[PDB]
Design an enzyme around this catalytic site. Structure first.
Site, PDB file in Angstrom:
ATOM      1  N   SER A   1       0.855  -1.175   0.000  1.00 46.25           N
ATOM      2  CA  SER A   1       0.000   0.000   0.000  1.00 46.25           C
ATOM      3  C   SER A   1       0.897   1.232   0.000  1.00 46.25           C
ATOM      4  O   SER A   1       1.916   1.263   0.693  1.00 46.25           O
ATOM      5  CB  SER A   1      -0.918  -0.028   1.211  1.00 46.25           C
TER       6      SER A   1
ATOM      7  N   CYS B   1      -7.300  -0.729   7.793  1.00 38.16           N
ATOM      8  CA  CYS B   1      -6.255  -1.336   6.979  1.00 38.16           C
ATOM      9  C   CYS B   1      -5.085  -1.957   7.748  1.00 38.16           C
ATOM     10  O   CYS B   1      -4.449  -1.308   8.575  1.00 38.16           O
ATOM     11  CB  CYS B   1      -5.745  -0.282   5.999  1.00 38.16           C
TER      12      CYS B   1
ATOM     13  N   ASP C   1      -8.784  -2.201   3.202  1.00 35.85           N
ATOM     14  CA  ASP C   1      -7.539  -2.379   2.456  1.00 35.85           C
ATOM     15  C   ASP C   1      -6.789  -3.362   3.337  1.00 35.85           C
ATOM     16  O   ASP C   1      -5.717  -3.060   3.852  1.00 35.85           O
ATOM     17  CB  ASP C   1      -6.745  -1.070   2.355  1.00 35.85           C
TER      18      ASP C   1
ATOM     19  N   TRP D   1      -5.090  -7.264   4.262  1.00 38.17           N
ATOM     20  CA  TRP D   1      -4.232  -8.296   3.669  1.00 38.17           C
ATOM     21  C   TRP D   1      -3.701  -9.221   4.776  1.00 38.17           C
ATOM     22  O   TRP D   1      -3.543  -8.799   5.925  1.00 38.17           O
ATOM     23  CB  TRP D   1      -3.056  -7.645   2.926  1.00 38.17           C
TER      24      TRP D   1
HETATM   25  C1  LIG Z   1      -3.197  -5.595  -1.420  1.00 38.44           C
HETATM   26  C2  LIG Z   1      -1.981  -5.990  -0.567  1.00 38.44           C
HETATM   27  C3  LIG Z   1      -1.233  -4.990   0.132  1.00 38.44           C
HETATM   28  C4  LIG Z   1      -0.077  -5.307   0.965  1.00 38.44           C
HETATM   29  N1  LIG Z   1       0.542  -4.224   1.596  1.00 38.44           N
HETATM   30  C5  LIG Z   1       1.635  -4.544   2.414  1.00 38.44           C
HETATM   31  C6  LIG Z   1       2.296  -3.427   3.098  1.00 38.44           C
HETATM   32  O1  LIG Z   1       1.977  -2.228   3.008  1.00 38.44           O
HETATM   33  N2  LIG Z   1       3.395  -3.821   3.928  1.00 38.44           N
HETATM   34  C7  LIG Z   1       3.894  -5.144   4.143  1.00 38.44           C
HETATM   35  O2  LIG Z   1       4.839  -5.441   4.859  1.00 38.44           O
HETATM   36  N3  LIG Z   1       3.261  -6.133   3.489  1.00 38.44           N
HETATM   37  C8  LIG Z   1       2.164  -5.908   2.639  1.00 38.44           C
HETATM   38  N4  LIG Z   1       1.547  -7.006   1.985  1.00 38.44           N
HETATM   39  C9  LIG Z   1       2.169  -8.387   2.276  1.00 38.44           C
HETATM   40  C10 LIG Z   1       3.429  -8.318   1.313  1.00 38.44           C
HETATM   41  O3  LIG Z   1       3.077  -8.267  -0.147  1.00 38.44           O
HETATM   42  C11 LIG Z   1       4.299  -9.604   1.549  1.00 38.44           C
HETATM   43  O4  LIG Z   1       3.506 -10.653   2.038  1.00 38.44           O
HETATM   44  C12 LIG Z   1       5.521  -9.474   2.553  1.00 38.44           C
HETATM   45  O5  LIG Z   1       6.306  -8.358   2.069  1.00 38.44           O
HETATM   46  C13 LIG Z   1       6.393 -10.759   2.739  1.00 38.44           C
HETATM   47  O6  LIG Z   1       7.528 -11.130   1.808  1.00 38.44           O
HETATM   48  P1  LIG Z   1       7.232 -11.717   0.341  1.00 38.44           P
HETATM   49  O7  LIG Z   1       6.674 -10.366   0.083  1.00 38.44           O
HETATM   50  O8  LIG Z   1       8.628 -11.897  -0.114  1.00 38.44           O
HETATM   51  O9  LIG Z   1       6.624 -12.762   1.176  1.00 38.44           O
HETATM   52  P2  LIG Z   1       7.176 -14.224   1.388  1.00 38.44           P
HETATM   53  O10 LIG Z   1       8.636 -14.457   1.425  1.00 38.44           O
HETATM   54  O11 LIG Z   1       6.612 -14.910   0.201  1.00 38.44           O
HETATM   55  O12 LIG Z   1       6.489 -14.817   2.541  1.00 38.44           O
HETATM   56  C14 LIG Z   1       5.134 -14.754   2.961  1.00 38.44           C
HETATM   57  C15 LIG Z   1       4.889 -15.972   3.856  1.00 38.44           C
HETATM   58  O13 LIG Z   1       5.866 -16.143   4.884  1.00 38.44           O
HETATM   59  C16 LIG Z   1       5.271 -16.896   5.939  1.00 38.44           C
HETATM   60  N5  LIG Z   1       5.565 -16.289   7.261  1.00 38.44           N
HETATM   61  C17 LIG Z   1       5.667 -14.986   7.735  1.00 38.44           C
HETATM   62  N6  LIG Z   1       5.985 -14.892   9.085  1.00 38.44           N
HETATM   63  C18 LIG Z   1       6.086 -16.216   9.469  1.00 38.44           C
HETATM   64  C19 LIG Z   1       6.396 -16.884  10.727  1.00 38.44           C
HETATM   65  N7  LIG Z   1       6.681 -16.222  11.896  1.00 38.44           N
HETATM   66  N8  LIG Z   1       6.396 -18.261  10.708  1.00 38.44           N
HETATM   67  C20 LIG Z   1       6.113 -19.124   9.539  1.00 38.44           C
HETATM   68  N9  LIG Z   1       5.820 -18.574   8.323  1.00 38.44           N
HETATM   69  C21 LIG Z   1       5.822 -17.106   8.347  1.00 38.44           C
HETATM   70  C22 LIG Z   1       3.783 -17.154   5.570  1.00 38.44           C
HETATM   71  O14 LIG Z   1       3.602 -18.523   5.089  1.00 38.44           O
HETATM   72  C23 LIG Z   1       3.518 -16.067   4.552  1.00 38.44           C
HETATM   73  O15 LIG Z   1       2.484 -16.554   3.701  1.00 38.44           O
HETATM   74  C24 LIG Z   1       0.347  -6.751   1.089  1.00 38.44           C
HETATM   75  C25 LIG Z   1      -0.414  -7.761   0.368  1.00 38.44           C
HETATM   76  C26 LIG Z   1      -1.534  -7.411  -0.428  1.00 38.44           C
HETATM   77  C27 LIG Z   1      -2.258  -8.567  -1.129  1.00 38.44           C
END
Ligand SMILES: Cc1cc2nc3c(=O)[nH]c(=O)nc-3n(C[C@H](O)[C@H](O)[C@H](O)COP(=O)(O)OP(=O)(O)OC[C@H]3O[C@@H](n4cnc5c(N)ncnc54)[C@H](O)[C@@H]3O)c2cc1C
Ligand SMILES: NC(=O)c1ccc[n+]([C@@H]2O[C@H](COP(=O)([O-])OP(=O)(O)OC[C@H]3O[C@@H](n4cnc5c(N)ncnc54)[C@H](OP(=O)(O)O)[C@@H]3O)[C@@H](O)[C@H]2O)c1
Ligand SMILES: Cc1cc2nc3c(=O)[nH]c(=O)nc-3n(C[C@H](O)[C@H](O)[C@H](O)COP(=O)(O)O)c2cc1C
Length: 603
Positions: free
Chosen positions: A388, A555, A600, A602
């Site tokens: 966001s 949010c 908003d 997630w």
């Molecule tokens: C519309 C929308 C808006 C978003 N806005 C934001 C925002 O403003 N800020 C923000 O930080 N994120 C936001 N997110 C979440 C973000 O996109 C990611 O999920 C986050 O940055 C995590 O890293 P990845 O992005 O690389 O996630 P990944 O490396 O893919 O990992 C996500 C996964 O890690 C796991 N996980 C997390 N903590 C633990 C734990 N303690 N133990 C076991 N598993 C765990 C879960 O299985 C989770 O599904 C948003 C998502 C959506 C759909």
């Protein structure tokens, strides 16, 4: 003659799907499902419930290793498709004992509707009540978004489950054949691009999802003062892209898998990660020419195209089953695909819960070395991560601001896992580019500034609201009159994770923020949440909402925060209505269809 169980004995069928369509779809599936019945030492027929009387299911235990699949589409108020009507009314007035009957249901629906999949869900739970033996979990197909997937993702796991149960076998059967190259102009080879061949080298507008822009990181900083977590502030330059955003839109970015994670795969795999290859669809008659943009090297595919991070789906382990030298470790990989039993237990327990990514699985099951290319067809596609926007289009309209918490946790699998988007986004140095784009949304401020604005959003959820509390502060300093502007932020401690403390108290002092109600959850002995502070202020709040005509915004995580806060409003609309709960809900209901209440969330 009539008993559809008998018309199976004369034909040699041990499986029969039942389409419950009304416009095609269901039957389409019903068939395609039993046309696979072959590839696995079985063979079925797709029948329509309208004809053969279903009360004959009780005869199904007569055929050996028999099954019945249901493909019911849902219409109207949970209404059962016209042909399924009789099968439906039966399932209700009946009481027959369908013991021994093995089944599985796959409903089709659309979340947009109230009674979403009321039919697939009933015909499913109603069988168990009669004494069936669910062979695979209920399939909830949602047309709204994409139906084919839901189905393909369901059938993708259904069969390996029908095997580990009944006993039938597979036969590998690859979806793409490999084609290596011993030349290829290095300029006609994909190296991270998403669409246009070289759109990352020669960035040409218009910029969107199919062709992302490569924004540069102007500044990256550690927002939190604590040290148990790493909240950061990212500013991305969009100057020269015409990419116009608005407070409340999302900015998606295309991450790069972990340099070390990737390379550390080829090693244990004993494979040349830099062979410019190309996967071709064995079905020349289709769009899906390649799984990921080809020609390209494996290394590139595991870095920008493949998801080598999220735990592999049961079916992917079941197809990698073969490439295990051991007779013990393979036996396992097969079981994960179980529908139930200690096989599923282990699965959820050893894979999904422990969070073992592919490299983790390759190292904990050493007698399992699949040929590189096949794997690079079984894994899913790397997904884009949305965030966001913490900026305002009225303020720096050339810097998309991001506020987000870095993922890095010790996993139950031993090692420590890192987020693909957050880990990657943490290392960018203030020329470091960030492939991205903006997703327009319906998360906006009121047209008239005079309108009050209530913003509930703790932790990284503060995000969109910063964009707001910058455009509101702009309007004030720009002549216009601005109504109230409340904020309900929360965190653990103020010496730990009190985000944008100065940026905030700063706006409070000058006017942007009428109030800054912050709910710390670990300062004192007990816990304090932003829904308590709403309850407290219910007094004022009702008036802003009722008479003021305010807009509300919630949010952050969707799980508990979104639910608990929205609960409070129901409690507020009801106390000061006065009205009963339902009453209250339909007040917030219409507010939603009004634009004065907007999520908003997630998770
Ligand atoms: C519309 C929308 C808006 C978003 N806005 C934001 C925002 O403003 N800020 C923000 O930080 N994120 C936001 N997110 C979440 C973000 O996109 C990611 O999920 C986050 O940055 C995590 O890293 P990845 O992005 O690389 O996630 P990944 O490396 O893919 O990992 C996500 C996964 O890690 C796991 N996980 C997390 N903590 C633990 C734990 N303690 N133990 C076991 N598993 C765990 C879960 O299985 C989770 O599904 C948003 C998502 C959506 C759909
Ligand atoms: N099973 C668990 O242990 C558990 C519980 C909650 C969240 N989570 C995970 O962590 C994520 C949270 O996002 P984040 O890391 O960005 O959040 P965060 O910034 O760490 O926390 C935001 C704020 O929300 C509070 N909060 C937690 N549960 C709440 C509830 N039911 N109602 C109202 N406020 C609540 C937090 O308090 P506290 O930190 O003191 O709880 C904190 O003050 C979620 O996505 C979820 O999947 C896990
Ligand atoms: C008038 C109408 C009403 C519908 N009502 C619902 C409903 O209440 N719940 C639901 O989940 N889907 C509902 N749908 C969506 C269908 O169930 C979905 O599009 C399904 O794919 C149709 O399958 P078919 O082509 O096999 O008949 C409705 C569709 C129409 C045209």
């Amino acid at each position: 003659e009539s008993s559809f169980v008998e018309k199976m004995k004369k034909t040699g069928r041990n499986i029969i799907v039942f389409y419950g369509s009304q416009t095609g779809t269901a039957e389409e599936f019903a068939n395609r499902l039993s046309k696979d019945a072959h590839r696995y030492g079985m063979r079925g027929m797709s029948a329509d419930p309208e004809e053969y009387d279903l009360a004959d299911l009780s005869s199904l235990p007569e055929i050996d290793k028999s099954l019945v699949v249901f493909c019911m589409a849902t219409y109207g108020e949970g209404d059962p498709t016209d042909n399924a009507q009789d099968f439906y009314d039966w399932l209700q007035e009946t009481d027959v004992d369908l013991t021994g009957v093995k089944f599985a249901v796959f409903g089709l629906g659309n979340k947009t509707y109230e009674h979403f999949n009321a039919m697939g869900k009933y015909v499913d739970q109603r069988l168990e009540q009669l004494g069936a033996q669910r062979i695979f979990e209920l399939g909830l197909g949602d047309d709204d978004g994409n139906l084919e997937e839901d189905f393909i993702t369901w059938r993708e796991q259904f069969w390996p489950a029908v095997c580990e149960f009944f006993g039938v076998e597979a036969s590998s059967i690859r979806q793409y054949e490999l084609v290596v190259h011993e030349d290829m102009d290095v300029a006609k080879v994909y190296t991270g691009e998403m669409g246009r061949l070289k759109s990352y080298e020669n960035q040409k507008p218009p910029f969107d999802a199919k062709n992302p822009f490569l924004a540069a990181v102007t500044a990256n900083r550690k927002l939190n003062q604590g040290t148990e977590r790493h909240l950061m502030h990212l500013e991305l330059d969009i100057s020269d892209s015409k990419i116009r955003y608005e407070s409340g839109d999302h900015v998606a970015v295309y991450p790069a898998n972990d340099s070390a994670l990737v390379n550390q795969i080829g090693e244990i795999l004993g494979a040349d990660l830099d062979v410019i290859m190309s996967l071709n669809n064995l079905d020349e008659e289709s769009n899906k020419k390649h799984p990921f943009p080809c020609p390209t090297t494996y290394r590139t595919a595991l870095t920008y195209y493949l998801d080598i991070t999220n735990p592999p789906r049961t079916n992917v382990l079941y197809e990698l089953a073969q490439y295990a030298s051991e007779p013990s470790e393979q036996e396992h990989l097969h079981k994960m695909a179980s529908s139930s039993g200690e096989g599923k237990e282990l699965y959820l327990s050893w894979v999904v819960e422990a969070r073992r990514h592919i490299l983790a699985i390759l190292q904990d099951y050493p007698s399992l070395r699949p040929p590189i290319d096949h794997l690079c067809e079984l894994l899913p596609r790397l997904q884009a991560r949305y965030y966001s926007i913490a900026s305002s289009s009225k303020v720096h309209p050339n810097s998309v601001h991001i506020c987000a918490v870095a993922v890095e946790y010790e996993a139950k699998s031993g090692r420590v896992n890192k987020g693909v988007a957050t880990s990657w986004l943490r290392a960018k140095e203030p020329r470091a580019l960030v492939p991205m784009f903006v997703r327009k949304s319906q998360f906006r401020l009121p047209f008239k500034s005079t309108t009050p604005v209530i913003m509930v959003g703790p932790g990284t959820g503060i995000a969109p609201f910063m964009g707001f509390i910058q455009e509101r502060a702009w309007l004030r300093e720009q002549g216009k009159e601005v109504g109230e502007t409340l904020l309900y932020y929360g965190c653990r401690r103020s010496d730990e994770d009190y985000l944008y403390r100065e940026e905030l108290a700063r706006f409070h002092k000058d006017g942007a923020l009428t109030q800054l109600n912050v709910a710390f959850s670990r300062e004192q002995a007990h816990k304090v949440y932003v829904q308590h502070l709403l309850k407290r202020d219910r007094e004022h709040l009702w008036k802003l909402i009722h008479e003021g005509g305010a807009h509300i915004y919630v949010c952050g995580d969707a799980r508990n925060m979104a639910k608990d806060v929205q609960n409070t409003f129901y409690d507020i609309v009801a106390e000061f209505g006065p009205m009963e709960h339902t009453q209250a809900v339909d007040y917030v209901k219409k507010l939603m269809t009004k634009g004065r209440y907007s999520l908003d969330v997630w998770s």
